Amino acid sequence: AMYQQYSPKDVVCSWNGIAIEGFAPDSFLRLQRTSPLVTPVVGAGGQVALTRNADKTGTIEIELMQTSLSNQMLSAIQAKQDNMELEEDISSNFVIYDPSGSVLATGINAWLQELPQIELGRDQNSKTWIFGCEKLDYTSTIP
Amino acid sequence: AMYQQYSPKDVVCSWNGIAIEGFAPDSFLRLQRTSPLVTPVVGAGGQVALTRNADKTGTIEIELMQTSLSNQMLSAIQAKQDNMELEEDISSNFVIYDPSGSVLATGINAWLQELPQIELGRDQNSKTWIFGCEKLDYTSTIP
Amino acid sequence: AMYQQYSPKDVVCSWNGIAIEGFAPDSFLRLQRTSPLVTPVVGAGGQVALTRNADKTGTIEIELMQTSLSNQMLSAIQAKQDNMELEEDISSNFVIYDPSGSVLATGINAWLQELPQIELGRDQNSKTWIFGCEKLDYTSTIP
Amino acid sequence: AMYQQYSPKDVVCSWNGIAIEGFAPDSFLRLQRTSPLVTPVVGAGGQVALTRNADKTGTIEIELMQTSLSNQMLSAIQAKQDNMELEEDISSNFVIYDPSGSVLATGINAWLQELPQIELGRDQNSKTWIFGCEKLDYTSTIP
Amino acid sequence: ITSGGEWIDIVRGVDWLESDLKTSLRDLLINQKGGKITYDDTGITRIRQVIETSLQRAVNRNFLSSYTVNVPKASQVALADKKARILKDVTFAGILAGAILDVDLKGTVAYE
Amino acid sequence: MWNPIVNVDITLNTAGTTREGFGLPLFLASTDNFEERVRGYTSLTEVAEDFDENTAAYKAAKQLWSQTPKVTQLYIGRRAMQYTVSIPITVAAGGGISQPYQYTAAENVLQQFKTQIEADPTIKDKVSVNVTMIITKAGDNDFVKVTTQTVYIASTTADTASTALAAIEAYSTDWYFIAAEDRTQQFVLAMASEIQARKKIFFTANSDVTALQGTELASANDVPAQLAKNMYTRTVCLWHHAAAEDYPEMAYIAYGAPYDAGSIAWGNAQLTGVAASLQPSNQRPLTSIQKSALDVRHCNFIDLDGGVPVVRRGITSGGEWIDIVRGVDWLESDLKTSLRDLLINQKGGKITYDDTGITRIRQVIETSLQRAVNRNFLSSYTVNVPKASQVALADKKARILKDVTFAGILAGAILDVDLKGTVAYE
């Protein structure tokens, strides 16, 4: 037997009600936790006690093509959020749909954290957008 | 004469009662001690005295394919352990079976320490799971 | 030639019939005298006369891990001594066993003097217990 | 064997009927006694006599995040106690629940002693609240 | 001590150890609700793992001090067992810790 | 039957591991406890059932399994027996045939028993009776026993080494080492002469005090000297005071039996629970002169390096190291098995009598010699085979291949060291 087949074409990302499209040629998505699950402590005599970290935030980096139209939407969304009172909410779930199940995480209460760097040359350079999340939840299809 | 032949096919890893399968193309397993065995101290006159460290913990890094089914099992196991009281035990022996004897260590009272980073591109990227252990025991077949 | 090797693993402390275990990662034991042996006095003309102090008390500070089980025993022992008449004895010899001979002192008629400070954070903090002694005796293996 | 595992997530503090939440990133709790248990006296001839101090008060310092909602509750509680007659009682037990047993003390008849200092910058600064107690009792699970 | 000379502690500890092994392997074999434990080295290593964990549970109590486990290769099991769906030839060993109950003492007193 | 889902039989008896190597031991003893001429056992517990603690057949087995790792199996042979009767009965025969006899109130009683036996139509033909009285074999009977207070019984071995060895070989050929209970000069020499014509090794002990004196082998005539004079390369002789009624030969056998052939050295061997060779008169370790006297006879002994006993040299009576003999025998066996596997399994084809078929045999011979080279037993080898175009036609009709030869070279080891030095201020 062989495992399920991966297909970049059938990967869809969404946030704030819009769909993000125009993935870059390579490495168009990254997910990572901020801190590890456990932190061991070893005494001078060799005894071990475990600390279970409570932090569960993370980061979602999505990278797009230079002339993708999704760049305009994110800039337009960012411009709106700068003119909103602190009481108004700016976070939304970052949902990734992948029929192959190669992505195991979803972003709970994600926010926009950084803007892309812009570079120009003879060829096209990608643009990286960075997001945060209150809790990067890892789930699976229960065997 | 020539030494025994190595065979990746006949290597099996197990932990928490499940079998971990779907090794990555390269470097699918790593074992290492946290501290050295001895630490010399040299005085201004050249005398030497040896300190024998009591720490014996270690780390076991196992790396799997992007779409391997063993990724779901570990996520499902991790999700359960987050909803358990501190009094309940979460450690188990990490047993590696290798008929060639190229692996000399076993993990005593190992725990899950970190979750894999997720990246996507045109091709398939591996996923790294990291474990700890109270005592990474090195054994051998007595000559 | 080289001197004897130090080993934290083979250090055992005892007091009041119980064994104290679970040493902290660093600096888990300290011994010190309260006063110096001699105190010179110099006149206006340069003459010198020596005073030999009779005080020989000291202090023994032992530091343990945050979740060590020896913390409970000492608290339970302290709780008993608060409900005892002044005529009852509360002192006992503090014996340190060290095969390397790097510790040269023992506590004669030691008592519990202070309780640990408790602090909590993301990681584990040690707990310091302080003892006194009527006479901190320095001995050696006679050459 | 290894000791019990510490977990900041499962630590709960309570006082005056309210629950205090929103611990700071580091060192969110501290407990300490005001005076030592014993005070030795040494004569000129070397004799020793012990004084057993009767003081058992202490201090509990709990530190919270800048925008934690528990800051408002404590300010509102403090405002009420300023408009109460001296005959009315203002003390209450400070109870700390910790399943790992790394905290050995509880505050009997604790009162609010100081208000936090307020500082603002580019980032978030914590706020420290200080309490007293008639008797900082150290207890343990009897072996 | 029992009438046979063996300490009660040893007898009771051995019985508890057997019970723990029996419960752990039972929990592994049950709860395969929709799958198999195949009769190959992959399935045998999973049993090795639980046996080792259950013996480590005894080592943690300071009842034992060390242990070893041996299991057969799936490529050399007789085919009668594969039809009967049973695993044999599993063995292990252990070593006991001990305690102190009496003391013998001698001393001297002198002017010198 | 109903079996538990998990079955756990925990016990408190510590156990050790065995090992498999080249050759198995056989102990030839005077016994009547079973009918078969050879019977095997796998542990000392089984041996205790058939034999009592005071028999030599039990001491030999007890010595063997003292060493670690253990030997997988042990064989015990049965010698022919003759029984004698006197006046200070029951007679048995092969197959469980037993007949009692009785006369009521010496030559008259013996003749009464003889007449009763010779009149019995069931057991008489399988035994013989003669007048004291003597009972021996007869016809096909290979087993006979006599038991029974006015009548006394005795027993004695009633065969030579040659006959017993032939009778035991005609039953079981699976054994390499052979030791014997009997230690008389005649039987030992006969057995040594017989084993020399076979691919087996004969371990024996000795305690003759006349062996510890005299350095001239020409004049000496004890058993070790006679063995050395005959150049019996397949006989191993060990000197030990306790060889009167104890069997350290089996411990020495078990020292190296569990291991592979040709890859170990039998000298400087450490035996568990075996004391050094002591002078019988004052129970003190042998002096250097007595050790030299044993040395000239090619007889082994247990030496003390100063605090530890160790068997020294480990050479056969012919001067050849035991390692060489055992390695050569294993090499022959390996060649024999490999060529047998090639020749068999041609189940539907041929090995034609041309160069194509001869090269295939060359290949297996070379592979089987490379197996020995890998052990570090040999260091190099060569093979030569005939051309199919020059083989005589008689061989082609007989379907046999001849003129195959090979050569090898041995590796060696180190067992002693010589050293010199100096000390000075300069």
Count of alpha and pi helical runs of chain A: 1
Strand content of chain E: 5-15%
Number of strands of chain E: 2
Oligomer: part of a larger assembly
Beta content of chain A = 35-45%
Tell me the strand order in the biggest sheet of chain A.
Answer: 2-1-7-8-9-6-3
Order of helices and strands of chain A: EEEEEEHEEE
The strands making up the biggest β-sheet of chain E line up spatially as 1-2
Q: How does the overall form of chain E come out from the CA principal axes?
A: elongated
Largest interface: A-B, 38 and 34 residues
N-end to C-end Cα span of chain E: 45 Å
Largest sheet of chain E: 2 strands, antiparallel
DSSP, total strands of chain A: 9
Helix percentage of chain E: 40-55%
Largest beta-sheet characterization of chain A: 7 strands, antiparallel
Gyration radius of chain E, to the nearest Å? 22 Å
Category by helix and strand content of chain A: mainly beta
Amino-to-carboxy terminus distance of chain A? 17 Å
Q: What is the percent of helical residues of chain A?
A: under 10%
Number of helices of chain E: 3
Rg on CA atoms of chain A, Å: 19 Å
InterPro entries (chain F): DUF3383
Protein name (chain F): Structural protein
Organism (chain F): Escherichia phage JohannRWettstein
InterPro entries (chains A, B, C, D): Phage_KPP10_Orf10 (IPR021695)
Looking at this protein, list some descriptive labels.
part of a larger assembly; 6 chains; A: 143 residues; mainly beta; 7-stranded antiparallel sheet; two-stranded antiparallel sheet; 1 helix; 9 strands; 8% helix; 40% strand; globular; E: 112 residues; alpha+beta; 3 helices; elongated; Structural protein (chain F); DUF3383 (chain F); Phage_KPP10_Orf10 (chains A, B, C, D)
Note the topology.
The structure is cut from a larger assembly and holds four copies of chain A (143 residues) and two copies of chain E.
Chain A: E1 12-15, E2 18-20, E3 29-33, E4 38-42, E5 48-52, E6 58-64, H1 70-81, E7 92-97, E8 105-114, E9 127-138
Antiparallel strand pairs in A: 1-2, 1-7, 3-6, 4-5, 6-9, 7-8, 8-9
Chain E: H1 8-29, H2 41-60, E1 64-70, H3 79-84, E2 91-96
Antiparallel strand pairs in E: 1-2
Helix pairs in contact in E: 1-2
